[PDB]
Design a protein around this ligand. Structure first.
Ligand SMILES: Cc1cccc(O)c1
Ligand SMILES: Cc1cccc(O)c1
Ligand SMILES: Cc1cccc(O)c1
Ligand SMILES: Cc1cccc(O)c1
Ligand SMILES: Cc1cccc(O)c1
Ligand SMILES: Cc1cccc(O)c1
Ligand SMILES: [Cl-]
Ligand code: NA
Ligand code: NA
Ligand code: NA
Ligand SMILES: [Zn+2]
Lengths: 30, 21, 30, 21, 30, 21, 30, 21, 30, 21, 30, 21
């Protein structure tokens, strides 16, 4: 696997991709 | 949160999976 | 078939735009 | 859920934001 | 609804999303 | 146009709908 | 089915790239 | 239109730019 | 039908994220 | 290939990176 | 055709779009 | 490579096709 900066749409894409059937939470405010 | 970890800094696969459900 | 998985990719990108700062939980099995 | 509702018919913006946090 | 900056692909995505069956015009030159 | 309104500045839903057909 | 709506998302993103500065009108019912 | 032409068969770049302004 | 072509669009965007700096060859007929 | 494998069933990240260079 | 800067996802999108059935190689390291 | 040609600088259609297979 590669390590890189992931922001915005690519960060949500990454979450959707990695988490799979688990789903994810994207809470950018923190 | 995820922004400071994975966007401003660089996250590993393990770190990104902290935000899976 | 993958169109449901493809559909989910568009869903989370749309939620990224619509929800903005308040974020969202993506739960494919819920 | 969102997959059942929005991958069968088109979900508008008004329907999609019901899934926001 | 949230108010945010929308540029490039996200601006076209937003237009496609908001305008729906009406469609839109994207004329960036102005 | 739409760039100065919605990209450089921030547009509301009403402002974005000015560019629907 | 949503694949036609999903197809349109790719259409306008492609038109964004191909048309560039000259822009485009997206008319789903035309 | 573009939906009828390009969501039935693949539209190349040359076919897509006919819809540019 | 275009869903296979639509699927390929998601494939290369996913490969862009997953592969990162090592890049990738996209060969639809291979 | 990748189209045959990953457009019939969902390919995970672990399956997709086998196609990286 | 228009000439513009293409980076990241838009560069891969452009390659996928232009190259068609030929496919492409995206080797960003060089 | 493609980054210096097409991202940092501007490529033509002919230049982009240098990276097709
Ligand atoms: C700024 C804005 C308006 C409408 C919908 C959005 O997702 C974003
Ligand atoms: C925005 C979007 C994508 C896919 C299906 C939908 O109903 C809505
Ligand atoms: C720069 C460039 C070349 C070819 C197609 C495009 O959409 C953009
Ligand atoms: C670029 C693109 C997306 C979807 C269908 C097409 O014919 C072309
Ligand atoms: C940084 C990172 C982790 C996991 C997958 C990716 O594509 C990128
Ligand atoms: C990332 C992705 C997109 C489409 C199909 C797949 O199997 C995987
Ligand atoms: Cl799709
Ligand atoms: Na790996
Ligand atoms: Na709202
Ligand atoms: Na042209
Ligand atoms: Zn799609």
């Amino acid at each position: 696997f590669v390590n890189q900066h992931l922001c915005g749409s690519h960060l949500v894409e990454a979450l959707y991709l990695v988490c799979g059937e688990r789903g994810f939470f994207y809470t950018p405010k923190t | 949160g995820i922004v400071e970890q994975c966007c401003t800094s660089i996250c590993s696969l393990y770190q990104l999976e902290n935000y899976c459900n």
